[PDB]
Swiss-Prot record:
Belongs to the fimbrial protein family. Residues 1-162 are annotated as: Receptor-binding lectin domain. The lineage of its organism: Bacteria, Pseudomonadati, Pseudomonadota, Gammaproteobacteria, Enterobacterales. This is F17e-G fimbrial adhesin. It comes from the Bacteria. It comes from Escherichia coli. A carbohydrate binds at residues 36-37, 81-82, 109-112. Disulfide bonds join 46-103. It is found in: Fimbrium. Essential fimbrial adhesion factor that mediates binding to N-acetylglucosamine-containing receptors in the host intestinal microvilli, leading to colonization of the intestinal tissue, and diarrhea or septicemia. Also confers adhesiveness to laminin and basement membranes. The gene is f17eG.
Length: 162
């Protein structure tokens, strides 16, 4: 069994927030969103995760896409399971597997996710739509007609440059 228990729209990173080429502001996992309970799963239900970044790919760095916000600022993006360190560097604008998934036993548990980004200097940024994450039922399991996708928006912030 499965049911949706999270929020549809989700803000990424704390509002306002101030931070001090291309240069990568290493903010760790601070500019992100994390929720371990987005879905309610039970009875051998198997689920994984797919991620999608809608921002334009303005470049590539060490393998992952540099998504653009402004002609001056860009982002590196990670999506995946609940724990931050278990993310997947995002590349492109297509649905990608960001978490291979698991299967809950004969009991009640949940499926979460996490998302974090890092500023990239190519200042201030206005809140912008980032992308989405969808649960991926498998091994026979199906989403039925329960909400499968959630979205993410980056809260405005500023980079105290040099
Ligand atoms: C701890 C919790 O509430 N449920 C977690 C869920 O967030 C996570 O997505 C899943 C797969 O790793 O493992 C569950 O145990």
């Amino acid at each position: 069994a499965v049911s949706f228990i999270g929020s549809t729209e989700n803000d990424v990173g704390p509002s306002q927030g101030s931070y001090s080429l291309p240069f990568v502001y290493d903010t760790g996992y601070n500019i992100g969103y994390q929720n371990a309970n987005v879905w309610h799963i039970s009875g051998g239900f198997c689920v994984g995760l797919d991620g999608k970044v809608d921002l334009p790919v303005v470049g590539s760095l060490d393998g992952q896409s540099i998504y653009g916000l402004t002609e001056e600022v860009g982002l590196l993006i990670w999506m995946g399971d609940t724990n931050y360190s278990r993310g997947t560097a995002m590349s492109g604008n297509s649905w990608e597997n960001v978490f291979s998934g698991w299967c809950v036993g004969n009991y009640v548990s949940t499926q979460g996710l996490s998302v974090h980004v890092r500023p990239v200097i190519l200042y201030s940024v206005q809140k912008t739509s980032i992308g989405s994450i969808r649960m991926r039922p498998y091994n026979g399991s199906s989403a039925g007609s329960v909400q499968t996708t959630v979205n993410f928006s980056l809260n405005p912030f500023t980079l105290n440059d040099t």
